[PDB]
Amino acid sequence: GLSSEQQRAFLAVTQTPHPAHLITGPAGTGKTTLLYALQEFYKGRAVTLAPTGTAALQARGQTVHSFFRFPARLLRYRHPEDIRPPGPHSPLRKAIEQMEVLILDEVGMVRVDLLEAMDWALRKTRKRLEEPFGGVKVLLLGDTRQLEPVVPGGEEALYIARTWGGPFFFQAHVWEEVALRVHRLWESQRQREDPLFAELLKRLRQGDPQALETLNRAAVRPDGGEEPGTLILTPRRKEADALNLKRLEALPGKPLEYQAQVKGEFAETDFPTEAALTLKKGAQVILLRNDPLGEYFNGDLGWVEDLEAEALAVRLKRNGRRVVIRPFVWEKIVVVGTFRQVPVRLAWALTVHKAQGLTLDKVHLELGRGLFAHGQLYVALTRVRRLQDLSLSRPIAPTELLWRPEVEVFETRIQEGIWQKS
DNA sequence: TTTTTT
Ligand SMILES: Nc1ncnc2c1ncn2[C@@H]1O[C@H](COP(=O)(O)OP(=O)(O)O)[C@@H](O)[C@H]1O
Ligand code: ALF
Ligand SMILES: [Mg+2]
Hints:
Blueprint: H1 4-14, E1 20-24, H2 31-42, E2 46-50, H3 53-58, E3 62-63, H4 64-68, H5 91-98, E4 101-104, H6 112-125, E5 137-142, H7 155-163, E6 180-184, H8 195-205, H9 209-219, E7 231-234, H10 237-250, E8 256-259, E9 261-264, E10 276-279, E11 284-287, E12 301-308, E13 311-316, E14 322-325, E15 328-332, E16 337-341, E17 344-346, E18 349-351, E19 363-365, H11 376-381, E20 390-392, H12 405-413, E21 418-419
Parallel strand pairs: 1-5, 1-6, 2-3, 2-4, 4-5, 7-18, 7-19, 19-20
Antiparallel strand pairs: 6-21, 8-10, 9-16, 11-12, 11-17, 12-13, 13-14, 15-16
The structure holds adenosine-5'-diphosphate, tetrafluoroaluminate ion and magnesium ion (MG).
The chain binds one DNA strand through helix 4, strand 15 and strand 16.
PDB class: hydrolase
Keywords: DNA helicase, hydrolase
Assembly: dimeric
């Protein structure tokens, strides 16, 4: 069962009427495991969300965007074009009106506009414009030393800097109206059988330069990616694409190319997957959409066992079952354009963003062009249970590590067990 | 740079 610190956080959150809680702690402390106990306690009263397909599946929930039907773009502060309440007799309206608890996992990855849009979407649907989250009890779980929210450099960064001052969930204006009670987990459950590896991760989290050189001497193994049962992580999509292409090319099976059908407007680069996707029998893949029948999920890893122009059979890693995947129609709505493609991507290599929240048997980090996101390295290192399960393509220099002053201000302030934005 | 999608 639950550890004594998970049990203490479980009781602190469930026994009080206080409507805003944050359960935070280092990687693998058992936050999502506590989230499963919270789901058994609240059952139907709670909706569980997470910012990524991976984190949502790990949390036995849904992405924030698929639940609220938010567009995959910047969500302007309380903007009616971006934040639309559901229809008068829709299944989403009923779900929002009846909800008592919102469980939000991997909150560190939740961008400020996404959290603010959740607040406003709840207040509008529930017709409670003066109550944060429309009276919904909010249980946030995550870690600000793991991946920072994704901020494209142009007009999105400007808008965020002008509206919130920064992109972090804790910079949301909702926190001026409600105090966030903070509960902590400290004990590594993922690395519990390797205590020196748990301590090395702790020193790396604290930016210790000696722990980095120790990590480099022990874990640098350029051939680490070629070993069976290893998942490769890369900072970039184009880096993962090159490593996936090489594995696909080595497979003996006849290739089959899947040309996406693009109709109407539908802008390039967005595009939820590649327009000309090549697959073979034996290819390692990741599923990009939840089955409307509930047999597979966005984030499911698997292997292609059969393939044809309009269908493929995928053996799932999660349950050892075969599922039949047909092309999916992504519709750009203002229904200006469509993008029809099989909702699959190659997955011998994935971005570090797609691994956050997972416990992996074996990981190899391919540095490529380098680290660009705060918490990116830390996420890659902390996916495994033991040091021997981790390998790096090259040594990492101390100059590659990132500092986020806004994260440090938040982390210092929550030491008091509360977050109250001025 | 990366995420969300429809
Ligand atoms: N109380 C516990 N007892 C045993 N194993 C646990 C416990 N809590 C977590 N774990 C395991 O440790 C790993 C990391 O837990 P997880 O909840 O995913 O951590 P986090 O969400 O904090 O990163 C998982 O393999 C999980 O099953
Ligand atoms: F904090 Al985690 F997997 F959710 F390390
Ligand atoms: Mg987790």
